[PDB]
Design a protein around this ligand. Structure first.
Ligand SMILES: [Mg+2]
Ligand SMILES: [Mg+2]
Lengths: 237, 237
């Protein structure tokens, strides 16, 4: 079984579809409207926004396409890709970030890139013209650190975080390590937050949605993942 | 050779990912905000909204999952699926539509379901509780006519259409029959509209994004389609 072939359409959409680009504009347009509203309401502490990087601000889809062509899934040559520091900015992202900066609002890029990839991440953020591309504002994941809540909470000590941007539910608080059924119910329960506080972007290529299917154990064979993937489809009879 | 296998991850995300559900909530949450805003400012003609049905209001992903499991591509069992009239509503859609009706706004379901599928479509819409599920409000595709602009224009003769909802760029005005290059540039050109007048939903399973890759000629071989799909991915060096 060529597992990587199973991602082809998802990758192709993400890389070529105008619809995908439109969804990125819709997210950043909505985020800017809500930033303005949050600034007009006012804050107790200095305002901040928090964004994920991969598939939120930086487009890593060329690595996923490399996996389709080679048949070798992530993280094969992921560090090689990160070190190249040539990911393009996703649609609307840079204009929104520059607008946020112009308003005096602090930005924190909270990303599960590893702390030892900081320098390459700064390089990529500089290449695309992302504001505040510094160690102070780029909060990467420690070895053995689970999730992003520690970094979210550190930011909240000194800022009021008015918006979160991400492609993965775990880019928002309260979606860590849940089963498919439980994370899906949590979405329903927090339905009012989406497009309000939590700004979501489309990523059918990879993420916690896939990891949840494997009980977050990625040490599964290609055949085992293939079976789980097939078993979790809901087919019409 | 097995083109349906390449849809698996796209279908699995659409069916299982809480992120997909969040994007639908974000879309409809934004729709309600923009509807209220438009009504508050007033209109010339009676207000309307236009929605697409498939992958906008109604979830047909069980048919797509079936294609993957059986390995049998479109049109296998599509009309049978339509006639079963058992698609679930997409997240946030029905509450939004009930709200819209209650504000005195007319809803028009402009959908490329065939005119002989009108009875089944009414049945499915009644089942999920969509309002205004009648021939006067469900505007299906005439086999002589391509695209939806004629139906959009007709509605616009008596109403001021304040919002459009879809998963396909051709559910909005200005995206008919364009190359990938041209349709993607048109998104850029119309970037301000998304989340404002055009409310977009994520569908990595199928659409004009795929048709455009084939220069809208689906009578290509699977070999040709497979080469086209592979050739349009962008990998890194
Ligand atoms: Mg991400
Ligand atoms: Mg549709």
């Amino acid at each position: 079984v060529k597992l990587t072939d199973q991602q082809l359409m998802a990758d192709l959409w993400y890389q070529t579809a105008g619809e995908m680009k439109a969804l990125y504009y819709q997210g950043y347009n909505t985020g800017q409207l809500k930033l303005d509203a949050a600034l007009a309401k006012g804050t107790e502490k200095k305002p901040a926004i928090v964004l994920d990087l991969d598939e939120t601000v930086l487009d890593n889809s060329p690595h996923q396409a490399m996996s389709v062509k080679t048949g070798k899934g992530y993280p094969y040559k992921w560090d090689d890709w990160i070190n190249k520091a040539e990911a393009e900015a996703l649609p609307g992202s840079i204009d929104f970030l520059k607008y946020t900066e112009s308003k005096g609002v602090d930005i924190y890029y909270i990303s599960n890139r590893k702390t030892n990839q900081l320098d390459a991440t700064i390089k990529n953020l500089e290449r695309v013209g992302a504001p505040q591309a510094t160690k102070e504002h780029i909060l990467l994941q420690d070895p053995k650190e689970k999730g992003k809540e520690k970094r979210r909470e550190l930011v909240s000590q000194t800022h009021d975080i008015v918006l979160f941007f991400g492609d993965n539910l775990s880019d928002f608080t309260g979606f860590d390590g849940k089963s498919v059924k439980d994370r899906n119910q949590a979405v329903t329960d927090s339905k009012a937050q989406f497009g309000e506080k939590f700004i979501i972007f489309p990523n059918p290529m990879y993420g916690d949605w896939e990891g949840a299917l494997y009980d977050y154990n990625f040490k599964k064979s290609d055949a085992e993942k293939d079976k789980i993937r097939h078993d979790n489809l809901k087919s019409f009879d």
